[PDB]
Amino acid sequence: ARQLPVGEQLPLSRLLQYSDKQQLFTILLQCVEKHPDLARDIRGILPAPSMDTCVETLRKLLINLNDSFPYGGDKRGDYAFNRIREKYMAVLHALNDMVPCYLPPYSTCFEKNITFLDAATNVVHELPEFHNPNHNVYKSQAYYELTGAWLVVLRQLEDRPVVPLLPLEELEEHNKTSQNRMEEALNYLKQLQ
Template sequence: KRQRNIPQGRPLPLPRLLSSLDNAQLQSIILGLTERHPQLLGEVQSLAPRPTITSSISVLHRLEAAVREAFPYGGDPAGDYAYNRVRPCLNELLSALMDYTPHFLPPHEPHFDTSLSFLDEATHIIHRLPNWSNPLHNISKRQAYEEMCGAWISVFRDAIGKSSGVGLVRGGWVEKVEQHNEVAGGRLGSVVEYLRGEVGWLRAVEQQQEQQGG
């Protein structure tokens, strides 16, 4: 009789092994490899697809949802107990926000409309951050607004250099920043002042032309 081939155990092929892992496991493996072999870091970064606004905001929204879910049931939602429960998730959200924002700033991001669309969404997230009874616990939100001010001005400066501000005025970005500043209680005032000083005249011309055309 012909002897049967008896299969022997063997590890999964790498593509099949990777397909069975979830995102957290893949991330852990890649980070572990780059920590052991720092020379791989640049190669991994060059091979990874560039994050989009959609994918980046999706991550931030997921972290924002974790903040909401961390609040305890009942009690004072602005008190110290709630803050201590929420703080780890809140810090994770703020850390991610500060990591993603420079990715969408010039010169790394050459298209100012992409930069501004991200900043618009990111600023909305900051608006929704919790407010606490203890003023010390609100420092991180104030700092987030300060960081966002610098980011907005950086993009506006780049956009004005490329298009003299025409795209900003016609895109309604002056009005959008003014609305953000109102919601933020004036914390984006430096951005509004900068933008009015740079493109205020152009905005007035556009409005006059609209009135004459109407």
């Protein structure tokens, strides 16, 4: 005669449609935790962003933060900071993510790694200072970490003879803006001459 349908829950796919990017993005990570092997699989079918895309990212982030200050209050008071700590931290995390990507073990492309650090530093110059000294440790800590960053790259051009033309001028403008908390790299850079 005839087959009569048997009810059942709806299919996983149909159920995920009612899940948004953050929702899938979020519930996808939990999967990696349960079955860590997923890391390899995902990394392979998903190509990394272009040096430009990454750079473009930070810009939006900091531009995002720059427009987030109070409607018209002292952008250096604590209050102004309270509203920005969030988009502030966003720009920093992204800084901590992308930088190791262009450093010595993982990236041997000297001329390609320095180029990036240049852009990253410029992003840090743009960070916002505050009246409270407690809110400026982030910008200081940045300058420190980056000085350590350029130092790692510069070292990848040590023994390999012939010392190509180095960004002697770049570090100058960088350190100038950074009020000298990048001297360790500048000397090392010049010392490579």
